[PDB]
Design an enzyme around this catalytic site. Structure first.
Site, mmCIF file in Angstrom:
data_model
loop_
_atom_site.group_PDB
_atom_site.id
_atom_site.type_symbol
_atom_site.label_atom_id
_atom_site.label_comp_id
_atom_site.label_asym_id
_atom_site.label_seq_id
_atom_site.Cartn_x
_atom_site.Cartn_y
_atom_site.Cartn_z
ATOM 1 N N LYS A 19 2.220 -3.615 8.876
ATOM 2 C CA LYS A 19 3.197 -2.541 8.891
ATOM 3 C C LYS A 19 4.526 -3.183 9.278
ATOM 4 C CE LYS A 19 3.945 1.902 11.364
ATOM 5 N NZ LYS A 19 3.229 2.879 12.237
ATOM 6 N N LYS A 57 8.712 6.668 5.877
ATOM 7 C CA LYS A 57 10.076 6.869 6.347
ATOM 8 C C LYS A 57 10.532 5.729 7.259
ATOM 9 C CE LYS A 57 9.777 11.943 6.156
ATOM 10 N NZ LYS A 57 10.096 13.213 6.863
ATOM 11 N N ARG A 101 5.163 2.951 1.346
ATOM 12 C CA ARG A 101 6.413 2.920 2.059
ATOM 13 C C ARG A 101 6.629 4.320 2.595
ATOM 14 N NH1 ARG A 101 11.291 1.617 -1.361
ATOM 15 N NH2 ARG A 101 11.091 -0.630 -0.984
ATOM 16 N N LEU A 124 0.828 -1.213 0.000
ATOM 17 C CA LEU A 124 0.000 0.000 0.000
ATOM 18 C C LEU A 124 0.859 1.259 0.000
ATOM 19 C CD1 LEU A 124 -2.729 -1.113 2.594
ATOM 20 C CD2 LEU A 124 -3.121 -0.913 0.138
ATOM 21 N N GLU A 177 7.091 -0.180 5.789
ATOM 22 C CA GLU A 177 6.470 -0.575 4.533
ATOM 23 C C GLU A 177 5.115 -1.168 4.950
ATOM 24 O OE1 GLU A 177 8.761 -3.312 1.857
ATOM 25 O OE2 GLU A 177 8.829 -1.517 0.583
ATOM 26 N N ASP A 233 1.136 13.334 15.793
ATOM 27 C CA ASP A 233 1.180 13.282 14.322
ATOM 28 C C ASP A 233 -0.232 13.339 13.776
ATOM 29 O OD1 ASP A 233 2.557 13.381 11.866
ATOM 30 O OD2 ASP A 233 2.875 11.189 11.780
#
Ligand code: ATP
Ligand code: LVF
Length: 327
Positions: A66, A47, A45, A43, A50, A154
């Site tokens: 993940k 930092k 990649r 889906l 993946e 975030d």
């Protein structure tokens, strides 16, 4: 040096819990079976990982995997501990399993799959009612994690998944999340550039849950005003100038004076002198349908330089902007 600061809410959550709750280094990971999952398609990649769509062959259900890039074991156990602490919470992504990936030799976090609506589609088609409805759902996730002594750090659109058919929302990507401990100095290199709070931009390390509320304000402003992103800085310095062009420079100097912060001298020739603008200046015929006096008042109370003066998630839920939302 700088004047210390503490959150006005959920200050003692982590001191009253057993140490096992926040001491993520001491946490012993319970490893699952990697053969239960068959990777289907990549889906993305990022930092630090993946991400893959996969199938849990023990129940035929879609999952998201993940696979963490090798970086630092401290960051990995922290994300695991937070996801386990928050599991089952309102609108919090569910961590289904933790496996050792046989190729990368690193942990792979297995999450429940969200049949998510495309992000541009959301940005372009959510109605006034839908914005209020989904903001209320994000607030449930934020008050839950803040009440649990955790800050997300975030908050941004890509981290808020919506399956619009089922009116289902999930707050994802807890890789930057941290336990809030009063008086702790945190790393300011958190959140994406357009969503970074003034506290981060002025290098004030003793921040708290209120950083998430600023970020939420940036998301709201971009949605209601049809300006993506709302504060469009070319870098972290110009990001603060972009904010100052709206909130003004006087309140910014009052903020740094309050906390006895010294602004980086690079700001002397770029900041200028700006008056605070009235929110009505951003209204035009293409965003009128998403703006109301309640939306502008709500936004105004999120987007404040002084972190201690912003609405908390629980206070935000009390706001008139949400009175039209079915509860
Ligand atoms: N639980 C989930 N269910 C469905 N899709 C997911 C889930 N978690 C993540 N994804 C999707 O995985 C894909 C890759 O995600 P990634 O972490 O690379 O973030 P991004 O959208 O690529 O970037 P950024 O966070 O930096 O903006 C994204 O489209 C994301 O929506
Ligand atoms: N920006 C933007 C689009 C979007 C993604 N996730 C979202 C969650 C909530 C709301 Cl209101 C909007 C969004």
């Amino acid at each position: 040096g700088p004047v210390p600061s503490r959150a006005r809410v959920y200050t003692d959550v982590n001191t009253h819990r057993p140490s096992e709750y926040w001491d993520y280094e001491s946490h012993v990971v319970e490893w699952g079976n990697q053969d239960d999952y068959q990777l289907v398609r990549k889906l993305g990649r990022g930092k630090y990982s993946e991400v893959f769509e996969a199938i849990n062959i023990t129940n035929n259900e879609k999952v998201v995997v993940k696979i963490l890039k090798p970086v630092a074991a401290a960051k990995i156990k922290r994300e695991i501990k937070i996801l386990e602490n928050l599991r089952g919470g309102p609108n919090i992504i569910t961590l289904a399993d933790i496996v050792k990936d046989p190729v990368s030799r690193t942990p792979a976090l297995v999450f429940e799959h969200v049949n998510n609506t495309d992000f541009k589609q959301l940005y372009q088609t959510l109605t006034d009612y839908d914005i209020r409805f989904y903001m209320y759902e994000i607030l449930k996730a934020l008050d839950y994690c803040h009440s649990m002594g955790i800050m997300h750090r975030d908050v941004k659109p890509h981290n808020v998944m919506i399956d619009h058919e089922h009116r289902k929302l999930r707050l994802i990507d807890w890789g930057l999340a941290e336990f809030y401990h009063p008086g702790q100095e945190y790393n300011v290199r958190v959140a994406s550039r357009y969503f970074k709070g003034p506290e981060l931009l002025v290098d004030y390390q003793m921040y708290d849950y209120s950083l998430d509320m600023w970020s939420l304000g940036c998301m709201l402003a971009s949605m209601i005003f049809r300006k993506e992103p709302f504060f469009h800085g070319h870098d972290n310095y110009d990001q603060l100038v972009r904010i100052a062009k709206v909130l003004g420079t006087e309140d910014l100097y009052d903020y740094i004076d309050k906390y006895n912060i010294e602004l980086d001298p690079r700001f002397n020739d770029i900041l200028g002198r700006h008056s605070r603008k009235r929110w009505e200046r951003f209204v035009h015929s293409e965003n009128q349908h998403l703006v109301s006096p309640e939306a502008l008042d709500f936004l105004d109370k999120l987007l404040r330089y002084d972190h201690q003066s912003r609405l908390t998630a629980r206070e935000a839920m009390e706001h008139p902007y949400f009175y039209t939302v079915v509860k």
